[PDB]
Amino acid sequence: IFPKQYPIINFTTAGATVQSYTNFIRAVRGRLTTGADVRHEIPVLPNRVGLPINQRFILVELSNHAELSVTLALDVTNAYVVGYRAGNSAYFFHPDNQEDAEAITHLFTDVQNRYTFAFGGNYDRLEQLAGNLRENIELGNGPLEEAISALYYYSTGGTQLPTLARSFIICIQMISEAARFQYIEGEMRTRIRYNRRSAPDPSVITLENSWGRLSTAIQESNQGAFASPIQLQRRNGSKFSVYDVSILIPIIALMVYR
Numbered sequence: 001i002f003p004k005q006y007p008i009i010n011f012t013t014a015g016a017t018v019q020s021y022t023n024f025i026r027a028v029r030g031r032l033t034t035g036a037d038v039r040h041e042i043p044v045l046p047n048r049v050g051l052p053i054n055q056r057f058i059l060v061e062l063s064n065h066a067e068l069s070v071t072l073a074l075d076v077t078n079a080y081v082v083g084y085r086a087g088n089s090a091y092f093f094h095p096d097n098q099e100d101a102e103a104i105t106h107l108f109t110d111v112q113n114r115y116t117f118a119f120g121g122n123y124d125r126l127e128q129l130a131g132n133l134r135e136n137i138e139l140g141n142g143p144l145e146e147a148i149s150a151l152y153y154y155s156t157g158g159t160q161l162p163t164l165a166r167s168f169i170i171c172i173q174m175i176s177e178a179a180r181f182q183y184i185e186g187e188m189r190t191r192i193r194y195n196r197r198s199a200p201d202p203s204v205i206t207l208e209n210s211w212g213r214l215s216t217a218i219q220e221s222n223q224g225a226f227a228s229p230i231q232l233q234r235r236n237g238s239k240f241s242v243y244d245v246s247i248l249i250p251i252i253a254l255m256v257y258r
Protein backbone atom coordinates (compact mmCIF):
# COMPACT_ATOMS: atom_id res chain seq x y z
CA ILE A 1 0.00 0.00 0.00
CA PHE A 2 1.55 3.35 -1.17
CA PRO A 3 -0.63 6.03 0.52
CA LYS A 4 -1.71 9.43 -0.86
CA GLN A 5 0.90 12.06 0.10
CA TYR A 6 -0.34 15.22 1.86
CA PRO A 7 1.61 18.37 2.75
CA ILE A 8 3.35 18.06 6.17
CA ILE A 9 4.20 20.90 8.62
CA ASN A 10 6.57 20.07 11.54
CA PHE A 11 6.44 21.53 15.07
CA THR A 12 8.47 20.48 18.13
CA THR A 13 7.92 21.53 21.78
CA ALA A 14 11.70 20.83 22.22
CA GLY A 15 13.25 24.33 22.36
CA ALA A 16 9.97 26.00 21.17
CA THR A 17 10.00 29.83 20.93
CA VAL A 18 7.51 32.60 19.97
CA GLN A 19 9.36 32.56 16.57
CA SER A 20 9.18 28.72 16.01
CA TYR A 21 5.48 28.67 17.07
CA THR A 22 4.72 31.71 14.85
CA ASN A 23 6.53 30.04 11.87
CA PHE A 24 4.44 26.86 12.48
CA ILE A 25 1.00 28.56 12.61
CA ARG A 26 1.84 30.77 9.56
CA ALA A 27 2.92 27.60 7.65
CA VAL A 28 -0.35 25.80 8.65
CA ARG A 29 -2.44 28.84 7.48
CA GLY A 30 -0.33 28.93 4.26
CA ARG A 31 -1.23 25.32 3.25
CA LEU A 32 -4.91 25.69 4.37
CA THR A 33 -5.60 28.82 2.18
CA THR A 34 -3.90 27.81 -1.17
CA GLY A 35 -7.50 26.95 -2.28
CA ALA A 36 -10.34 29.60 -2.23
CA ASP A 37 -9.58 33.33 -1.50
CA VAL A 38 -10.39 36.54 0.43
CA ARG A 39 -13.60 38.29 1.72
CA HIS A 40 -13.08 41.53 3.79
CA GLU A 41 -9.29 40.72 3.92
CA ILE A 42 -10.24 37.30 5.53
CA PRO A 43 -9.42 34.12 3.52
CA VAL A 44 -12.28 31.58 3.02
CA LEU A 45 -11.18 27.91 3.25
CA PRO A 46 -11.80 25.61 0.25
CA ASN A 47 -15.43 24.39 -0.17
CA ARG A 48 -16.08 20.66 0.61
CA VAL A 49 -17.71 20.37 -2.90
CA GLY A 50 -15.52 19.58 -5.98
CA LEU A 51 -12.27 19.47 -3.87
CA PRO A 52 -10.08 16.54 -5.08
CA ILE A 53 -9.26 13.94 -2.33
CA ASN A 54 -5.52 14.55 -3.12
CA GLN A 55 -5.94 18.20 -1.82
CA ARG A 56 -8.37 17.44 1.09
CA PHE A 57 -5.85 17.09 4.00
CA ILE A 58 -2.67 18.52 5.50
CA LEU A 59 -0.52 16.74 8.11
CA VAL A 60 0.97 18.24 11.27
CA GLU A 61 3.95 16.24 12.59
CA LEU A 62 4.43 16.97 16.33
CA SER A 63 7.61 16.01 18.25
CA ASN A 64 8.54 16.67 21.89
CA HIS A 65 11.51 16.53 24.34
CA ALA A 66 10.78 12.76 24.80
CA GLU A 67 11.57 12.48 21.01
CA LEU A 68 8.07 11.00 20.44
CA SER A 69 6.34 11.87 17.11
CA VAL A 70 2.60 11.87 16.23
CA THR A 71 1.04 13.06 12.97
CA LEU A 72 -2.31 14.92 13.09
CA ALA A 73 -4.46 15.09 9.94
CA LEU A 74 -6.34 18.42 9.41
CA ASP A 75 -9.29 18.84 7.00
CA VAL A 76 -8.37 21.86 4.76
CA THR A 77 -12.15 22.75 4.60
CA ASN A 78 -12.41 23.63 8.36
CA ALA A 79 -8.74 23.51 9.68
CA TYR A 80 -9.91 20.87 12.25
CA VAL A 81 -8.24 17.62 13.37
CA VAL A 82 -9.91 14.47 11.89
CA GLY A 83 -7.45 11.90 13.25
CA TYR A 84 -3.83 11.07 13.97
CA ARG A 85 -1.15 8.40 13.54
CA ALA A 86 1.24 7.11 16.26
CA GLY A 87 3.54 4.25 15.16
CA ASN A 88 1.55 1.38 13.58
CA SER A 89 -1.96 2.73 14.51
CA ALA A 90 -4.16 5.55 13.22
CA TYR A 91 -7.16 6.91 15.20
CA PHE A 92 -10.05 8.86 13.60
CA PHE A 93 -12.93 10.81 15.18
CA HIS A 94 -16.38 9.49 14.18
CA PRO A 95 -17.09 11.16 10.78
CA ASP A 96 -20.29 13.35 10.60
CA ASN A 97 -21.46 11.87 7.21
CA GLN A 98 -20.80 9.05 4.64
CA GLU A 99 -18.75 11.56 2.47
CA ASP A 100 -16.24 12.43 5.29
CA ALA A 101 -16.11 8.68 6.27
CA GLU A 102 -14.97 7.81 2.68
CA ALA A 103 -12.52 10.80 2.59
CA ILE A 104 -10.64 9.73 5.82
CA THR A 105 -10.11 6.16 4.37
CA HIS A 106 -7.44 7.95 2.17
CA LEU A 107 -5.40 8.99 5.28
CA PHE A 108 -2.53 6.88 6.72
CA THR A 109 -3.66 4.05 4.32
CA ASP A 110 -0.40 2.03 4.81
CA VAL A 111 -0.87 1.99 8.66
CA GLN A 112 -1.40 -1.58 10.01
CA ASN A 113 -4.28 -0.73 12.44
CA ARG A 114 -7.11 1.79 11.81
CA TYR A 115 -9.45 2.72 14.71
CA THR A 116 -12.50 5.01 14.49
CA PHE A 117 -13.87 6.35 17.80
CA ALA A 118 -17.65 6.43 18.47
CA PHE A 119 -17.27 10.16 19.42
CA GLY A 120 -16.62 13.09 17.05
CA GLY A 121 -13.94 15.78 17.47
CA ASN A 122 -16.47 18.29 18.97
CA TYR A 123 -15.44 19.87 22.33
CA ASP A 124 -18.79 18.99 24.03
CA ARG A 125 -18.04 15.21 24.04
CA LEU A 126 -14.19 15.57 24.35
CA GLU A 127 -14.72 17.64 27.58
CA GLN A 128 -17.05 14.90 28.99
CA LEU A 129 -14.38 12.22 28.17
CA ALA A 130 -11.58 14.43 29.64
CA GLY A 131 -13.56 15.15 32.84
CA ASN A 132 -13.01 18.92 32.39
CA LEU A 133 -14.26 21.91 30.38
CA ARG A 134 -11.78 23.81 28.15
CA GLU A 135 -11.82 26.58 30.86
CA ASN A 136 -10.10 24.08 33.27
CA ILE A 137 -7.53 22.54 30.77
CA GLU A 138 -4.17 24.40 30.72
CA LEU A 139 -2.56 25.32 27.37
CA GLY A 140 1.11 26.13 26.71
CA ASN A 141 4.31 24.34 25.63
CA GLY A 142 4.12 22.07 28.74
CA PRO A 143 0.55 20.85 28.08
CA LEU A 144 1.47 20.32 24.35
CA GLU A 145 4.64 18.29 25.32
CA GLU A 146 2.40 16.10 27.55
CA ALA A 147 -0.36 15.85 24.91
CA ILE A 148 2.15 14.56 22.30
CA SER A 149 3.35 11.85 24.74
CA ALA A 150 -0.29 10.94 25.61
CA LEU A 151 -1.30 10.61 21.87
CA TYR A 152 1.85 8.52 21.22
CA TYR A 153 1.26 6.05 24.08
CA TYR A 154 -2.44 5.50 23.24
CA SER A 155 -1.10 3.22 20.38
CA THR A 156 0.09 0.72 23.11
CA GLY A 157 -2.68 1.36 25.74
CA GLY A 158 -0.33 3.43 28.00
CA THR A 159 -2.77 6.42 27.85
CA GLN A 160 -6.27 6.34 29.53
CA LEU A 161 -9.19 7.76 27.44
CA PRO A 162 -9.67 10.85 29.70
CA THR A 163 -5.98 11.86 29.19
CA LEU A 164 -6.28 11.18 25.42
CA ALA A 165 -9.42 13.43 25.26
CA ARG A 166 -7.64 16.16 27.34
CA SER A 167 -4.67 15.85 24.92
CA PHE A 168 -6.95 16.27 21.84
CA ILE A 169 -8.46 19.43 23.41
CA ILE A 170 -4.92 20.82 23.89
CA CYS A 171 -3.74 19.99 20.32
CA ILE A 172 -6.97 21.23 18.62
CA GLN A 173 -6.78 24.63 20.38
CA MET A 174 -2.99 25.18 19.97
CA ILE A 175 -3.09 24.14 16.26
CA SER A 176 -6.59 24.35 14.65
CA GLU A 177 -7.98 27.29 16.73
CA ALA A 178 -4.61 29.18 16.51
CA ALA A 179 -4.63 28.77 12.67
CA ARG A 180 -8.30 30.01 12.61
CA PHE A 181 -7.74 33.10 14.87
CA GLN A 182 -4.80 35.58 15.11
CA TYR A 183 -6.32 36.29 18.59
CA ILE A 184 -5.82 32.63 19.70
CA GLU A 185 -2.39 32.44 17.98
CA GLY A 186 -1.57 35.56 20.10
CA GLU A 187 -2.79 33.80 23.32
CA MET A 188 -0.49 30.82 22.60
CA ARG A 189 2.51 33.08 21.63
CA THR A 190 2.01 34.92 25.01
CA ARG A 191 2.07 31.60 26.95
CA ILE A 192 5.28 30.51 25.14
CA ARG A 193 6.95 33.97 25.60
CA TYR A 194 6.41 33.90 29.41
CA ASN A 195 6.82 30.07 29.85
CA ARG A 196 3.22 30.04 31.18
CA ARG A 197 0.66 27.26 31.57
CA SER A 198 -2.98 28.48 31.75
CA ALA A 199 -6.52 27.62 30.63
CA PRO A 200 -8.15 29.70 27.87
CA ASP A 201 -10.29 32.59 29.17
CA PRO A 202 -13.95 33.09 28.08
CA SER A 203 -12.88 35.39 25.17
CA VAL A 204 -10.94 32.45 23.61
CA ILE A 205 -13.66 29.84 24.37
CA THR A 206 -16.48 32.00 22.88
CA LEU A 207 -14.39 32.72 19.72
CA GLU A 208 -13.84 28.92 19.28
CA ASN A 209 -17.62 28.30 19.82
CA SER A 210 -18.52 31.15 17.38
CA TRP A 211 -16.13 30.33 14.45
CA GLY A 212 -18.93 28.79 12.29
CA ARG A 213 -21.46 31.59 13.11
CA LEU A 214 -18.79 34.35 12.51
CA SER A 215 -17.80 32.70 9.14
CA THR A 216 -21.49 32.68 8.01
CA ALA A 217 -22.24 36.23 9.37
CA ILE A 218 -19.17 37.72 7.55
CA GLN A 219 -19.84 35.92 4.20
CA GLU A 220 -23.64 36.68 4.20
CA SER A 221 -22.99 40.35 5.26
CA ASN A 222 -24.12 43.38 3.18
CA GLN A 223 -20.55 44.72 2.46
CA GLY A 224 -19.50 43.83 6.06
CA ALA A 225 -22.86 44.65 7.80
CA PHE A 226 -24.42 41.61 9.60
CA ALA A 227 -28.18 40.78 9.16
CA SER A 228 -28.16 39.79 12.92
CA PRO A 229 -25.59 40.80 15.60
CA ILE A 230 -23.20 38.11 17.04
CA GLN A 231 -22.64 37.93 20.85
CA LEU A 232 -18.99 37.33 21.95
CA GLN A 233 -17.39 37.40 25.45
CA ARG A 234 -14.68 39.61 27.00
CA ARG A 235 -11.88 38.06 29.15
CA ASN A 236 -14.09 38.78 32.25
CA GLY A 237 -17.00 36.76 30.69
CA SER A 238 -19.28 39.80 29.98
CA LYS A 239 -21.12 39.66 26.58
CA PHE A 240 -20.94 42.30 23.78
CA SER A 241 -22.58 42.36 20.31
CA VAL A 242 -20.70 42.56 16.94
CA TYR A 243 -22.68 44.18 14.04
CA ASP A 244 -19.87 44.53 11.44
CA VAL A 245 -16.76 42.67 10.09
CA SER A 246 -14.36 45.63 10.85
CA ILE A 247 -13.51 44.76 14.53
CA LEU A 248 -13.04 41.05 13.52
CA ILE A 249 -10.40 41.55 10.71
CA PRO A 250 -7.48 41.41 13.26
CA ILE A 251 -9.20 38.54 15.23
CA ILE A 252 -10.24 35.85 12.63
CA ALA A 253 -7.60 34.54 10.14
CA LEU A 254 -9.64 31.82 8.24
CA MET A 255 -13.39 31.16 7.57
CA VAL A 256 -15.33 27.97 6.65
CA TYR A 257 -17.39 28.25 3.41
CA ARG A 258 -20.98 29.57 3.97
Ligand SMILES: Cc1ccccc1-c1ccc(C(=O)O)s1
Binding pocket: 203, 207, 232, 233, 234, 235, 236, 247, 248, 251
Ligand atom coordinates in the same frame (compact mmCIF):
# COMPACT_ATOMS: atom_id res chain seq x y z
C1 LIG B 1 -13.28 38.71 21.19
C2 LIG B 1 -13.16 39.92 20.63
C3 LIG B 1 -13.52 40.15 19.28
C4 LIG B 1 -13.44 41.24 18.70
C5 LIG B 1 -12.97 42.35 19.34
C6 LIG B 1 -12.65 42.18 20.53
C7 LIG B 1 -12.63 41.11 21.44
C8 LIG B 1 -12.25 40.96 22.78
C9 LIG B 1 -11.52 39.92 23.40
C10 LIG B 1 -11.47 40.36 24.74
C11 LIG B 1 -11.93 41.41 25.25
C12 LIG B 1 -12.02 42.34 27.01
O1 LIG B 1 -11.53 41.52 27.72
O2 LIG B 1 -12.52 43.37 26.72
S1 LIG B 1 -12.67 42.27 23.99
